[PDB]
Amino acid sequence: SHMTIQKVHGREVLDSRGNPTVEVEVTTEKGVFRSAVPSGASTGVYEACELRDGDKKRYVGKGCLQAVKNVNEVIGPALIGRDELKQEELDTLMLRLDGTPNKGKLGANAILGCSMAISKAAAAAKGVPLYRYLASLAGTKELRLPVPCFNVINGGKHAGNALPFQEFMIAPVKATSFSEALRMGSEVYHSLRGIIKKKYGQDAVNVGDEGGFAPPIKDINEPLPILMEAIEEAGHRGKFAICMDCAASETYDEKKQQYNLTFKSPEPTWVTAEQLRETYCKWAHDYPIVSIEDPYDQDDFAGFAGITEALKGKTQIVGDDLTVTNTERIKMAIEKKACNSLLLKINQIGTISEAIASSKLCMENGWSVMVSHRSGETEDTYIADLVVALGSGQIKTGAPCRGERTAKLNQLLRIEEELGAHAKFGFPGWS
Amino acid sequence: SHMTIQKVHGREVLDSRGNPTVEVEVTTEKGVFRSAVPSGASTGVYEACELRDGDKKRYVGKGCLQAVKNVNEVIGPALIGRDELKQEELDTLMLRLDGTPNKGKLGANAILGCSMAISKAAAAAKGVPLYRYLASLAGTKELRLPVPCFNVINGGKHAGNALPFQEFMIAPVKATSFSEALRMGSEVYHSLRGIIKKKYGQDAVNVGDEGGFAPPIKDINEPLPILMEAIEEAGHRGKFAICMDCAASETYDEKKQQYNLTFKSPEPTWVTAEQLRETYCKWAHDYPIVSIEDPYDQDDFAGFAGITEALKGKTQIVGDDLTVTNTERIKMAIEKKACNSLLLKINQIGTISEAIASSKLCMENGWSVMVSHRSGETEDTYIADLVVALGSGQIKTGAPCRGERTAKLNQLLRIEEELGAHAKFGFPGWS
Numbered sequence A, B: 001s002h003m004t005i006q007k008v009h010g011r012e013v014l015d016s017r018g019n020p021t022v023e024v025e026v027t028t029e030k031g032v033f034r035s036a037v038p039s040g041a042s043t044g045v046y047e048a049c050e051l052r053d054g055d056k057k058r059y060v061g062k063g064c065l066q067a068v069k070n071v072n073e074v075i076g077p078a079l080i081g082r083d084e085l086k087q088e089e090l091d092t093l094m095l096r097l098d099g100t101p102n103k104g105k106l107g108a109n110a111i112l113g114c115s116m117a118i119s120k121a122a123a124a125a126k127g128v129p130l131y132r133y134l135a136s137l138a139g140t141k142e143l144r145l146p147v148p149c150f151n152v153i154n155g156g157k158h159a160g161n162a163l164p165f166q167e168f169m170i171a172p173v174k175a176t177s178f179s180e181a182l183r184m185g186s187e188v189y190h191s192l193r194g195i196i197k198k199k200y201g202q203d204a205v206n207v208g209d210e211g212g213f214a215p216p217i218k219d220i221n222e223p224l225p226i227l228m229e230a231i232e233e234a235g236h237r238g239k240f241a242i243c244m245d246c247a248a249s250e251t252y253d254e255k256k257q258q259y260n261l262t263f264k265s266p267e268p269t270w271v272t273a274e275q276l277r278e279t280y281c282k283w284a285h286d287y288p289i290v291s292i293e294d295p296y297d298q299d300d301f302a303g304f305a306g307i308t309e310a311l312k313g314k315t316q317i318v319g320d321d322l323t324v325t326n327t328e329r330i331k332m333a334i335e336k337k338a339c340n341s342l343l344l345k346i347n348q349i350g351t352i353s354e355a356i357a358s359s360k361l362c363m364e365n366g367w368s369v370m371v372s373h374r375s376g377e378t379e380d381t382y383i384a385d386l387v388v389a390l391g392s393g394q395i396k397t398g399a400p401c402r403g404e405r406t407a408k409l410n411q412l413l414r415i416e417e418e419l420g421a422h423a424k425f426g427f428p429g430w431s
């Protein structure tokens, strides 16, 4: 009993946008284990409940005092004296404590920090690093360092510009180590700054929420030649692929059944799903675009399925808002062959146990898994250990810029160093 | 002997701009103690040596493999088996290992991470938090939470814009707790985004290196009414002061003996020190500007002294590039009455022992001390503990935005919580 959970404490802290979020400490005799909860901007309608206070006098309603109170007064007291090694048992307890399908009573943002911190306390009890403990929970046969997918031109709800689509990413798929991947990503990011500055001016080189440049671009095709130029200039021709996150739900109008490609402007630029399909086909032909995330609205299973079939073998189609890391939505996606990659967001579902189940489900059905940050991140590095633990070969955790992004990339350097020179790197289908 | 330093290891990691830097781990039986080294953009000519590789094939010459090698092969082996509690002894050893006045042999960026990590290992050996251990080293009689000075409009070498001067800051001087200070800062930051967007457009709300907005502003007077408007709109009229960092050396031409207020533009806008003096006098009259940092070139002791006398009792004048956290430069500043506040940058001098000596020297001579980040920061939170330890009441560690800034602000929340409701907050002269 001396080896059990001794204390559980929640507190309100700031995320990388200056918005409140929840952090939790679980204390055992082995130490203090701290996990913070991230927060999305383009949040899917099917995501678990992110509970906020709504007090206009604090952070104009974005406080997390209630979620923190739920940790301190409800969840914490239930965990005290419990065996932190029983991840599934304790995750299930918290699910039952909440008692709702969407974690709407206690908050996914109260539950998740507890789930995370328990797993860290457990890894410490076992005497192994977090990634090793999580690999055991997930039954992973082979750890690997992932190819990082760097969102280097920021748009959508993440940036001050006309650009409707959210993420334009570069991935050093031909790197042979994580160390080399990170350096190559950084080097391209640096040549890209100069290219943008020359083309658009110095007012164009400030950064969006995920550390990507936020140039004054309206056209969704316009960033792509710029990415290729940057890759070339940095000396890395042929070593990189491109990943896209359209976050297309954010541009979708349900009543019109069209997508507004200028939703951040005075006018109106309405396009059909069919107009998007041929844009995506042209993208995949003209560039090494190996991944497209949320190409259509989050309930457009037919549109998703169409493009998944059309780019099969060339470009993986990633469910993010479609699937929300939720086994129920994933089962619908599998049945409809709507996509073939899961974007894994721990806070879309709200427990580690459920997020792991989602990963295994997708992998057993032949999908890839790309572990992801949110656009509102913290100094927390949990997803670095998680992606290695799942052995998925794919992470997106920002441009190589801003500490809430670089903290993850740096943790991956530390994990790589621990595993040594025979540690596997990358996503085999892209290598 | 089982209680001594067991292992010392350095590694190259990324800072918040995607540039390589040095991180060091000191291992004892109490755990692994990790410290990372920050890096400036507007670096004073008298700063200690930041050692870089110059290999154009890695990070276009910005690698830190040599500094890391110096940690691993030179400094580390000397520390193994040593009593980590002897901070001054070990800092002095590393000074003698290097053997040069500027740390030019081993690198201040090799030495500093070791100095930091030793102090953390020591605090752990003592069984106290870092801030408590550092307060002992410094002989501090009263801990306090500092007023945070938030650089919310970014210029100079930190931003993509015409704005010649570096930092336009807001400080919630009338807050009565750090928790309240941070919330108020964030709330103003948020109203400021909307104000900038409305005035300049959405292309104007992307961020510079320290998380401040980077609007397309040329005139150094133009951000000030905007700061006042934001303070008002957020509901915090009367609660805030303004702090400036001109970083004026960056605009200075030695041969002309003038300052170029459009150094990031095609033309040429030459002004005299006398033209700056009356700008500063007008600033101090028209706004609650309580601090001006580096108003003149780093060797302009006469200019510094003039404005220090002129704004005595109203506005503190902060040496940063003038003093470079160095007792020798500080003694020159004291003799000339050139300034009355030290900007404390641990990596300007390169050991904790010397940085502490600099703080005490300044405080004994009646100066204030503002502990500072660099514009290239990491997920490291050392300066949060340091500022509390020194009891100085002043920190600048960024806008409430970007994780390399928010990591510090969040650590200050944790320290505040540990100290309780009777913990002192703020800078008394501003309260």
Ligand SMILES: [Zn+2]
Pocket (backbone or CB within 6 Å): A040, A041, A042, A043, A044, A247, A320, A321
């Ligand atoms: Zn989203």
Ligand SMILES: [Zn+2]
Pocket (backbone or CB within 6 Å): A245, A247, A293, A294, A320, A321, A343
């Ligand atoms: Zn997405």
Ligand SMILES: [Zn+2]
Pocket (backbone or CB within 6 Å): B040, B041, B042, B043, B044, B247, B320, B321
């Ligand atoms: Zn500077």
Ligand SMILES: [Zn+2]
Pocket (backbone or CB within 6 Å): B245, B247, B293, B294, B320, B321, B343
């Ligand atoms: Zn400065």
